[PDB]
Ligand binder design. Structure first.
Ligand SMILES: [Mg+2]
Ligand SMILES: [Mg+2]
Ligand SMILES: [Mg+2]
Ligand SMILES: [Mg+2]
Ligand SMILES: [Mg+2]
Ligand SMILES: [Mg+2]
Ligand SMILES: [Mg+2]
Lengths: 129, 208, 83, 71, 129, 98, 83, 23, 218
RNA sequence: AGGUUCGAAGACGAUCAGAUACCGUCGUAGUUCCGACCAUAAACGAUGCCGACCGGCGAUGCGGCGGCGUUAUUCCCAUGACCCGCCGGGCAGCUUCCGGGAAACCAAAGUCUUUGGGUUCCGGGGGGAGUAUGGUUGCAAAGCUGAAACUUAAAGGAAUUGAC
RNA sequence: UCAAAGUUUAAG
């Protein structure tokens, strides 16, 4: 019931972690002195607060990513895991499922490939008013 | 498009389309889109003339090729299905992407950081990527879109009739466009197939 | 929209217009040559009959007239093919 | 709306004649009323004998006696 | 009720023109209408039209070309006395340069310029520009 | 100015409706007008429900329900917070609340 | 634009919508001139020259730009008979 | 209030009628 | 010194686009104010129509701010009608001038009857209306001059339109509105599709296509 | 003729400085039926009637047409109740740079300085005044028709910021 | 699950 951080804290911590993720750790008093070294923080109290939020962000990073932050190793990991390729799904083994109305499509476009035809479904009545 | 001999249909492409489910449009049909449809089935799912889809797809390619400096084709997806696909398209094509949360006044505002003034858009859903589409009528920006049956065609100067709901189909459509822009100039044969898998473009719902 | 050949409209979308609003005003009705089982005399009933149509032999009845088309009596075949 | 037709002249011309009397200035000039009421019986000026010097008080926002003449 | 046929047809083609229509159907048809259209055609303002003879009143379909700014009609069909024709075209057409007042005459249905050449007055039908 | 296209009065093709005296103020109101809760409710409510179940003769027993269609007139609806006001744009959301 | 002599005047000749002959204004910033590429015929493959279509903003905001482009394409043999 | 101004006026007219009926 | 954010502005800076007629042809929005200044350096003159002080009520007295209506023109084919509000009058006038520049348009002038000389009046009787006020321009023969109310007479002169009969309806006292109406009139001169056009269009490249190798700056 | 209920007037009881009012208790005319008047309401969509054209979408009421399946009834038939469409014409709804509009808003209040489909009624700053006066209708209450002198610089509309 | 609460220099 009181101490929220101002943006002057929050921005400085995020910027610290963006540049010096490696130096920073969970133990507060270590990285409290890191914050002194790598950044010209004019007051003692402000420094002391920043480090406090730096620790808090570290804890969030050690448990999935954070929205407003760009860690270099996490970005590379993301790049690796979203340029994945499997042996392909758009072939859909042999036998693709198709309807007669979608079969007539293929007749109109001149085709007779490997794909099964099946419908039964009588017009049900979609949603309810 | 000129579906005349070389860049016509072929079976293997249609088989990909059918597997993606792109033909399966939607339940509601906008009166602008009625042009691009075979039928409706039972329950009530419209079906899209796949020839007609290709024709527009080729026409989109021909538009994108005509833009000389490739970078100033812009390629937007707001939704998180095209978000990967657009970025893979830009990577292949040499275009510029905008993957999600399109900032208001990127095409407007001289002052702004991300003020880009391109000669073309490629929008995923015109229903969802609507801000950039509107900005494209404060600058003289033409537009490509991947339109469903439901999709409204305000400002979309060349719609492509697709399933744009399903991720599979969206990625497929991006991959098909990427091929065709590259085929229509550059380093793809047409006789040979392409190295790139269409699954490269598909969105991953947190699976592993 | 923006382009509709109003002089060459397809028959798929003339059947689904009002009888008057079509490019050429045409009727939606037809005549039908009704058989009936017992009597071999073939009558010629008008689809929208609005009269009880008794047969030529005057034994049975063919049409009970409803609002729209006439109601043919159960075992009574017919043929359009005309005009 | 408007009568408009080719053989309307009369209708049109009569209606305009009727409505002219709701034009305030017209009615002033064509009914007697004002010419009856005007002490200058339709005249630019009038001579007249002064029968008392009388102070008029000015209307609210301006305070001043006016110094009139009862003619 | 359907009082003045010509008037309705012209207003319909004008409404079509505004909304960027390519061709347009006009429903009651007449001699006068067709004659008005032929004059508008002669000066390029409309494309070649065609008239669907049902065995009745008739219909027309008109190929537009987006060159017609407005096509109007003057009821009542006043009688212009050639002196007055100059006054009309001043306070009716948008210039002394383009536009036409199509008036019928003893001679026939024509634009003012054909009437002034042939030195004829007559009853005004409408205008276009 | 016209506040609501409707006029808070769902008439539209009638010219007259039978009126209702409101279930609170007794104020006379059009039936198409007037706010209308339909209130189904347990007779006994959450407090005494278990006490009554405990001292019931019949085994289990499903309770009854007390049904009321109320008829609030605008004044009485607003005052009793059946209906609050809305912003000029949010006035037009004629879906019920959850 | 010419005067009585025949000398040209008028500081420019406006673009004009391909889909409506309706002149694209000096500040109609919702307009397009869309460039489409041809091909060599034998190989696909873009072959230098263009096909250009201009559209007025008005048609775009109406929603009838993609139809009108498509019509223009199939008039000029870019698009190959959708039926 | 207009309605009461009219009512006032219709009472006053009613008196006037009565007054003039005396003569 | 000018450094231009706009793609277009960069081309104009580098003497690539020869005249603003090229820009107008392709309808590209003039956003950088320096472009127009460069093309119409001199001739372009700025006349303050009106300075109207609007105000808006606070808890603490009332805020008041000045709204500067400025026309601009070369007396020869171009005119712009800018309005800017601000806390001090100078800053309003300065910003209004720039907004006029940005919004300048080309006026089509035409002949009256006989088609001789240089075009001296309006082509056809165009009109332009803005918030009640409506303004009709009527073409007029040589020498007539501008037969019009002060405000239109000031802008029409700047447009270079020598001769013009005019009309006006609505609350013409709302001077801003009256200017904005007359501006839509003279804007609309190049939007009127006369038979003088009709000839099918050529279509050229557009500067963004012409100089795409330049714009990817080397 | 009839009078349950409520209920102008009226009478009390409260409340209030005062309340001849709001609340409460009674209660007359009226409220109900038949037969004669009366002719006015914010009699309102505050929107004259007829006619044409100019965008979507979904709904809903009636009639008609067509369709594969249900329920069923009994074994099919005929069904009706559902289901999915089309057509006409109703009551409305959402939707948008149709186009309008001072606007709020309106697919009509659109197709209007690019002004003319047809035709009725009707307004001309605010007040005096729907008054006076005559004429007429009405058992009456009133209704229709309907001025002037004199006064007055604004009254009024929509929307915005504040203040309340 | 609604007691009572009326008025505000002529002197800018
Ligand atoms: Mg009523
Ligand atoms: Mg009481
Ligand atoms: Mg009674
Ligand atoms: Mg009345
Ligand atoms: Mg009106
Ligand atoms: Mg008019
Ligand atoms: Mg008056």
């Amino acid at each position: 019931m009181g101490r929220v951080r101002t943006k002057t804290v929050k921005k400085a911590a995020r910027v610290i972690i963006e540049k010096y993720y490696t130096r920073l750790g969970n133990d507060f008093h270590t990285n409290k002195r890191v914050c002194e070294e790598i950044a010209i923080i004019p007051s003692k109290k402000l420094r002391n607060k920043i480090a406090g939020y730096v620790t808090h962000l570290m804890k969030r990073i050690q448990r999935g990513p954070v929205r407003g932050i760009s860690i270099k190793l996490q970005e590379e990991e993301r790049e690796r895991r979203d340029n994945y390729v499997p042996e392909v799904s758009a072939l859909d083994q042999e036998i693709i499922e198709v309807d007669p109305d979608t079969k007539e499509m293929l007749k109109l476009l001149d085709f007779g490939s490997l794909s099964n035809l099946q419908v039964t479904q009588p017009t049900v009545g979609m949603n309810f008013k | 498009s000129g579906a005349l001999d070389v860049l016509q249909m072929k079976e293997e492409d249609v088989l990909k389309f059918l597997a993606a489910g792109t033909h399966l449009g939607g339940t509601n049909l906008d009166f602008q889109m009625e042009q691009y449809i075979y039928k409706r089935k039972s329950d009530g799912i419209y079906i899209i003339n796949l020839k007609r889809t290709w024709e527009k797809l080729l026409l989109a390619a021909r538009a994108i090729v005509a833009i000389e400096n490739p970078a100033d084709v812009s390629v937007i997806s707001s939704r998180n299905t095209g978000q990967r696909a657009v970025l893979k398209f830009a990577a292949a094509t040499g275009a510029t992407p905008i993957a999600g949360r399109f900032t208001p006044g990127t095409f407007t505002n001289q002052i702004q950081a991300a003020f880009r003034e391109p000669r073309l858009l490629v929008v995923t859903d015109p229903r969802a990527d609507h801000q950039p589409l509107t900005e494209a009528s404060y600058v003289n920006l033409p537009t490509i879109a991947l339109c469903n049956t439901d999709s409204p065609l305000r400002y979309v100067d060349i719609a492509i009739p697709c399933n744009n709901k399903g991720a599979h189909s969206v990625g497929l459509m991006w991959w098909m466009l990427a091929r065709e822009v590259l085929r229509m100039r550059g380093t793809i044969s047409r006789e040979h197939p392409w190295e790139v898998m269409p699954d490269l473009y598909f969105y991953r719902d947190p699976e592993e | 929209p923006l382009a509709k050949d109003l002089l060459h409209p397809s028959p798929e979308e003339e059947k689904r217009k009002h009888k008057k609003k079509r490019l050429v005003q045409s009727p939606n009705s037809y005549f039908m040559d009704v058989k009936c089982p017992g009597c071999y005399k073939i009558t010629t009933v008008f689809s929208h009959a609005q009269t009880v149509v008794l047969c030529v032999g005057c034994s049975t009845v063919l049409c009970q007239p409803t609002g729209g088309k006439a109601r043919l009596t159960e075992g009574c075949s017919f043929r359009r093919k005309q005009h | 709306g408007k009568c408009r037709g080719l053989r309307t002249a009369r209708k049109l011309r009569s209606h305009r004649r009727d409505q002219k009397w709701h034009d305030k200035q017209y009615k002033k000039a064509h009914l007697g009323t004002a010419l009856k009421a005007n002490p200058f019986g339709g005249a630019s000026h009038a001579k007249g004998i002064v029968l008392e010097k009388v102070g008029v008080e000015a209307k609210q926002p301006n305070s001043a006696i006016r110094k009139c003449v009862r003619v | 009720v359907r009082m003045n046929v010509l008037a309705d047809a012209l207003k319909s083609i004008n409404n079509a023109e505004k909304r960027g229509k390519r061709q347009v159907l006009i429903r009651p048809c007449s001699k006068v209408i067709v004659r008005f259209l032929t004059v508008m055609m002669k000066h390029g303002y409309i494309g070649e039209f065609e008239i669907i003879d049902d065995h009745r009143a008739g219909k027309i379909v008109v190929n537009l070309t987006g060159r017609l700014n407005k096509c109007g009609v003057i009821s009542p069909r006043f009688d212009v006395q050639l002196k007055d024709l100059e006054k009309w075209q001043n306070n009716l057409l948008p210039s002394r340069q383009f536009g036409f007042i199509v008036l019928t005459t003893s001679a026939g249905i024509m634009d003012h310029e054909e009437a002034r050449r042939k030195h004829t007055g007559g009853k005004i039908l409408g205008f276009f520009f | 100015t016209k506040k609501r296209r409707n006029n808070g009065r769902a008439k539209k093709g009638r010219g007259h409706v039978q009126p209702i005296r409101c279930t609170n103020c007794a104020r006379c109101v059009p039936k198409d007008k007037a706010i209308k809760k339909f209130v189904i409710r347990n007779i006994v409510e959450a407090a005494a429900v278990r006490d009554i179940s405990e001292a019931s003769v019949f085994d289990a027993y499903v309770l009854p329900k007390l049904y009321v269609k109320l008829h609030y007139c605008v004044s009485c609806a607003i005052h009793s917070k059946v209906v609050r006001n809305r912003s000029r744009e949010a006035r037009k959301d004629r879906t019920p609340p959850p | 634009m010419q005067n009585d002599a025949g000398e040209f005047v008028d500081l420019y000749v406006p673009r004009k919508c391909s889909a409506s002959n309706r002149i694209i204004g000096a500040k109609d910033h919702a307009s397009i001139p869309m460039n489409v590429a041809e091909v060599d015929k034998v190989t696909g493959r873009f072959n230098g020259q263009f096909k250009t279509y201009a559209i007025c903003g008005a048609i775009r905001r109406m929603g009838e730009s993609d139809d009108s482009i498509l019509r223009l394409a199939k008039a000029h043999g870019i698009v190959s008979q959708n039926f | 209030r207009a309605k009461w101004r009219k009512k006032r006026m219709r009472r006053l007219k009613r008196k006037r009628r009565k007054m003039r009926q005396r003569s | 010194e000018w450094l231009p954010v706009t793609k277009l502005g960069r081309l104009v800076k580098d003497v690539k686009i020869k005249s603003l007629e090229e820009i107008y042809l392709f309808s590209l929005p003039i956003k950088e104010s320096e472009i127009i200044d460069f093309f119409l350096g001199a001739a372009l003159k700025d006349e303050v129509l009106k300075i109207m002080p609007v105000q808006k009520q606070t808890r603490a007295a009332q805020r008041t701010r000045f709204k500067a209506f400025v026309a601009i023109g070369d007396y020869n084919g171009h005119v712009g009608l800018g309005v800017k509000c601000s806390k001090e009058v100078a800053t309003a006038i300065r910003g209004a001038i720039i907004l006029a520049k940005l919004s300048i348009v080309p006026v089509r002038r035409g002949y009256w009857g006989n088609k001789i000389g240089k075009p001296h009046t309006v082509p056809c009787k165009v009109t332009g209306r803005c918030g009640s006020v409506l303004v009709r321009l009527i073409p007029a023969p040589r020498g007539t001059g501008i037969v019009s109310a002060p405000v239109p007479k000031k802008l029409l002169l700047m447009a270079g339109i020598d001769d013009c009969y005019t009309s006006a309806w609505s609350c013409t006292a709302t001077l801003g509105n009256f200017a904005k109406a007359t501006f839509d009139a003279i804007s609309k001169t190049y939007s009127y599709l006369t038979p003088d056009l009709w000839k099918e269009t050529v279509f050229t490249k557009s500067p963004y296509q012409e100089f795409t190798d330049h714009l990817v700056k080397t």
